[PDB]
Design a protein around this ligand. Sequence first.
Ligand SMILES: [Mg+2]
Ligand SMILES: [Mg+2]
Ligand SMILES: [Mg+2]
Ligand code: NA
Ligand code: NA
Ligand code: NA
Ligand code: NA
Ligand code: NA
Lengths: 204, 1011
Amino acid sequence: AALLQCTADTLADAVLITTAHAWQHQGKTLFISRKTYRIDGSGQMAITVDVEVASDTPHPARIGLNCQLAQVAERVNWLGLGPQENYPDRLTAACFDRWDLPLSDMYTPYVFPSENGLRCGTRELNYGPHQWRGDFQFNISRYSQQQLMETSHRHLLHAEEGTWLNIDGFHMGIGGDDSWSPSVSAEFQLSAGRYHYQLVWCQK
Amino acid sequence: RRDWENPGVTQLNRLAAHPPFASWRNSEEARTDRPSQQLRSLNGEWRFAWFPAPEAVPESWLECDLPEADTVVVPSNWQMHGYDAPIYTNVTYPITVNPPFVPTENPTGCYSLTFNVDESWLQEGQTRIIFDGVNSAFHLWCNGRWVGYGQDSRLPSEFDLSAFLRAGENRLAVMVLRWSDGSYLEDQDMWRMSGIFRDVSLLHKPTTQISDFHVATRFNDDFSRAVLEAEVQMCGELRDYLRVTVSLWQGETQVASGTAPFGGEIIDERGGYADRVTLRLNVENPKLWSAEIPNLYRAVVELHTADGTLIEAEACDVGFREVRIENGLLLLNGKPLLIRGVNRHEHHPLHGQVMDEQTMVQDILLMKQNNFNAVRCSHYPNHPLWYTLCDRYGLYVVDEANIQTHGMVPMNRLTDDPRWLPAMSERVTRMVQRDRNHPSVIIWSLGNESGHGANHDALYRWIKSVDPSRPVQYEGGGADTTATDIICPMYARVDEDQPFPAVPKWSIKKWLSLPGETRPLILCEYAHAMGNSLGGFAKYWQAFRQYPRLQGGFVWDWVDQSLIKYDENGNPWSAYGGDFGDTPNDRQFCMNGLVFADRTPHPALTEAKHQQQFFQFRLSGQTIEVTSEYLFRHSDNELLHWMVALDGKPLASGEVPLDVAPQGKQLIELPELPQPESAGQLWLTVRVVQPNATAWSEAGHISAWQQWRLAENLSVTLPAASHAIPHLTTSEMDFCIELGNKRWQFNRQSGFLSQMWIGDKKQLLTPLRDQFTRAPLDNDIGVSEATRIDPNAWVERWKAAGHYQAEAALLQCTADTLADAVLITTAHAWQHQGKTLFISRKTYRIDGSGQMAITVDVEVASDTPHPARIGLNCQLAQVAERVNWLGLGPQENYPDRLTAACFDRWDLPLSDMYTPYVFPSENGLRCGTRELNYGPHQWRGDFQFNISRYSQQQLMETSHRHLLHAEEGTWLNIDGFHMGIGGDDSWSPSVSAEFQLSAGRYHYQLVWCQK
Ligand SMILES: [Mg+2]
Ligand SMILES: [Mg+2]
Ligand SMILES: [Mg+2]
Ligand code: NA
Ligand code: NA
Ligand code: NA
Ligand code: NA
Ligand code: NA
């Protein structure tokens, strides 16, 4: 990530932070992310994200944000598709409703660790004192994408400190027509070039 | 006798049908197809009197000319001379449905001609009269004496006048009836016209004459050998000294000849035909006929004596080709066809249903130039010259019998009735007898929309028996009946089933593989081109190319059926059904053409051209793969031009000759392209250019094109920090932003940008507001009317939801000052009677560079019908001459009709940004636009736009294009998103789900600045 812009403006009833980043590899700009964070007097932080994706780079796996929360809470509560893991090209079985599960249920123990436990079409997510609202896909677990990527077997995984949260405006299909050639259909690839999502982060 | 109310009487004293005759008395004239003195045209000035009924015709008209009669040009339709109103109706009959009876008020056209006949014509031989087209029925008199009667408006009626004519002055009297029992088989959806609308001629033959001839061409397995078989029939006295010679010519070279006396082979217990002979000519390595290469020979049939004296000669153009269906594929010369077809009615805006060579040639040229290879004679045999031209220019023809009974309840009432079999048989049999020698005819059709009856099955088998060289098709009764060799639906969709009872229209892909089904599928009608249409056209062609047994179709249709009317100042305007005082009518449903009546193209024609391309392209790295879709011809008149541009700025270009075999491939390696200095998207454009002129095109003709995105460099470089700081001024009614000379005014009561100034110059006439509606397209409306509402039609769903009446309620309007900018935040709710339809949330950011960044985020209630568009609109004060944009163009393009459009820098006059559809609607949109320039203004983003002197409101409220008036300034519509136009048909919703605005939440952003 290369920082292009980071400004702060004090408004009548809010503070507005504006940022711009470029992700580059060997001279090539892959992605540009432009954001505003508006924190108002009600204590809510509205995050607006606008992403550019180079048309000649391979379509990305996801367009989102991630962080490691210090909190480890017992339950995960959301208003979206569930209760089980669902992805854009595998979500017909899932139902839109209010779901409440133990954190461990938000992780799928695939023998070969990978991205897992996504829930799509989520309008509200609750974890400990935090609430995220918008229209997003998320997963939440004690395992980072890095660890999942670097660990060969599920039994070798160790719970990390706190909780890793991945919130996606957009997520690529998983495919599966076969498992030896690209099988994600065009309509589930992230090929639009420009992507927009908005999130509100507040305390319960 | 009232023969015009009797299906048992279709003719009286009519001669047999036959291929085109000229009775040359010189063989060389027959070879070269020069005019014949034995075939005399009676076209020109005739006398005409209109009557309300045949009973109203005075008995003196048979012998003497009427003083009340006017002089008119023949051929003509008498409605085009203003004698009565041309009635237009779709499904319903224009008369009372009571077969076989017609109205007592039956408009009667009394034609007459006084002409000279030379004694030499009457001293020997036979003089016949030929009426190529009389609508719908007629009685004939010659010198006061009754000659005969004829029906079928679309085939020649011929009568022997040898005993009726006298040396010197002769008078013909033709009583033409608008309505007859023949009308029940002539219920086509078009203008109901009448009169002598095709040629009238006299033909002199000797008494010993060629009465018929049939030409067949058969081939060996690889088409390297052929046998031409010519059956010749005679009339007159049989003599042993009589001979027939058939000679075959390739240009001026005679390739084969055969001579024989009369007397065919034994066929039964009674012997054979003494008045017939069959000649068989061997042809080695024949040059084959196709639409790609219309190679023709000339066959000359000589009737003569053994000592060498010619009696007469007839002749025809011969195309060596084989049409067969094998293993479910329609094949021509062993190769599977892909039909790039169109339906073509015979229509001229000035002459009605009268056809001329100039118009026919104009149509064929435009068709071939737009990659059509096929034409369906909807829905009747055509003027005889049409087939000659298709033979010579190369178009595949579906010849169709003049049988349509669409108004019957049920549709097969007459066609399943054995009492109507005689009349139906004549329409099929007489077409085959006339047109069977034309190579351009590859498929016979039994008619149109007449259900499926036993009469169809009988006539299907008749054709199969007499002419096995051509498949038979027929759509009626579900498109896949026992009376068709080809599954030939009308408006069956690509992926979507329409499971109507008894006659379902399956998805064409699904239809092929139904249990037991093996036949090819070629749509007799598809892609209804009514108004702003042809949305989803690319979906058909992708399917056609992927599925072997999907072999194309015929677009509905070629030409708008509008006629010319004049106002007070004598200025012409295009009129449809209902403008001529005819009621009940079917409004603008006569205008479904790819071209206007004057043959000016609609925007949809370019989409057709692109999808029907004969070359296919793929790109892999630096390699362009070109695939030929030609079946027979090498690419011997083709050059590939390639261009690489960065956001419209050309960086590299070149040309490479194409040398591709039919069905072959060519790989073209592009040279090392230098990496651009600037940020932006590189685009590759290729086009196939024809360097040499042809019979159908000019030098430089572009036949194919394609585009790809190459490398993109995203802009990361921060622009030089602007020194100027915009200032906010607040009043109770307005937020005002100032930057030097420039001013932006936001109205606080409405929440919209109401005005902009540069110095003292106002920029807006109407504020910038959200827009969620469009002036409804013909496809949006369907068959919905004010008296007969179709609640399923898109326009009615939008109306009932309050979309057009939606009023903006302000929720939020704030102003913030940033370090180097002013931020305006707004929120509006669009509500109809308590219901929130849409919410629009916006920010306007104006910085020291004078750029106004607009961000728009829209919520659409999930239970409201999906909106026509999600955009902004305003009336600009400026009227500028030019429109300049970086985006898809140059022509009008919509989300489901933008494949033909290319991404480049385009610059057109403002008037070219409006499409003059006869029925005004949303028009002129250009999609995928990143920059738009108009006068002092520049807009940047990723949007769809149209720009014109007409508001959406005026387009929607005005019935005809000629009633439109340029409004003050310029109406700009900038859409983040726009709904598809559809067009699979124009009587039910046809916008595919992927082109409907159903996402619920939408985001777009624009930048507005001075240029
Ligand atoms: Mg579902
Ligand atoms: Mg009759
Ligand atoms: Mg394309
Ligand atoms: Na792993
Ligand atoms: Na095909
Ligand atoms: Na029509
Ligand atoms: Na060439
Ligand atoms: Na209108």
